[PDB]
Write a protein that binds this ligand. Structure first.
Ligand SMILES: Nc1nc(=O)c2ncc(C(=O)NCC(=O)N[C@@H](Cc3ccccc3)C(=O)O)nc2[nH]1
Length: 263
């Protein structure tokens, strides 16, 4: 019974996309854990299998549909279903391998890719880095068709990998970061695709570090500042959770919240 959120690229607007992302964050977080105003994803440790995934059903103007499975612990796209086939990225560990057996349980054809689903591996397969892959509603429309045609040989591996790269950033990264959701809003509003700039790429690559820096901070102050990049590629130093409240929407669980040492 995993929850399903629907989005279509057909006639998508800033509003329909914002409703989608808000719904996905609503199914990822439980309200149990908020630190400095920033929600934390459920802890993997002890999380029951019936609560472990959400499903995102994507449809497009071509009238096709694919369903992505996201792990609630990290918002990671672990696989997808297109009609009678499902495809999963190579799991990180035995427990995740058992977990994905609980997805798409009726599907006639189940495959586990031999490669993992991280950006570095997908960029190698795609023959292109994130910085050279355009995002927006047109890329997402195209990516939905490409995932849908995989099983029949119509979609080549490099184009499947590029299509995952588009879906992950427009769904998981946008759920993780209001900043990235706003970057996608822009592209959808003007119907103008464009590759992510260094502000988007540095936020993506730093999500885990920022999650840990916030959770281990002293009252919000980082022991070690983290360097991000602005749009023009110039350095932006982060010393404190405060400047990230408009930027990061949710964190991956990294440590227990200390007992509130209150004055
Ligand atoms: N399939 C898939 N779904 C994702 O949501 C996703 N999200 C992110 C990445 C990716 O490599 N990120 C680059 C990176 O530097 N990630 C950090 C931060 C992080 C991101 C996502 C999940 C956990 C940690 C890390 O691997 O340590 N790849 C993913 N692939």
């Amino acid at each position: 019974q995993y929850p399903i959120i629907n989005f279509t690229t057909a006639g998508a607007t800033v509003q329909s996309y914002t409703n989608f992302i808000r719904a996905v964050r609503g199914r990822l977080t439980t309200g149990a854990d908020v630190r400095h105003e920033i929600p934390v994803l459920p802890n993997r440790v002890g999380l029951p299998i019936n609560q472990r995934f959400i499903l995102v059903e994507l449809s497009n103007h071509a009238e096709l549909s694919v369903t992505l499975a996201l792990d609630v612990t990290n918002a990671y796209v672990v696989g997808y279903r297109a009609g009678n086939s499902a495809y999963f990225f190579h799991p990180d560990n035995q427990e995740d391998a058992e977990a994905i057996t609980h997805l798409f349980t009726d599907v006639q054809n189940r495959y586990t890719f031999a490669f993992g689903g991280n950006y570095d591996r997908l960029e190698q397969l795609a023959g292109n880095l994130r910085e050279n892959i355009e995002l927006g509603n047109g890329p997402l429309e195209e990516a939905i068709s490409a995932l849908y045609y995989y099983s029949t040989g119509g979609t080549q591996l490099p184009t499947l990998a590029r299509s995952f790269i588009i879906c992950i950033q427009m769904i998981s990264e946008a759920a993780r970061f209001q900043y990235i959701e706003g970057e996608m809003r822009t592209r959808i509003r003007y119907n103008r695709r464009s590759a992510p700039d260094p502000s988007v790429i540095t936020l993506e690559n730093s999500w885990g570090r920022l999650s840990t820096a916030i959770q281990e901070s002293n009252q919000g102050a980082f022991a070690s500042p983290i360097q991000l990049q602005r749009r023009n590629g110039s350095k932006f130093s982060v010393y404190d959770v405060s400047i990230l409240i408009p930027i990061i929407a949710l964190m991956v669980y990294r440590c227990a919240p200390p007992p509130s040492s209150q004055f």
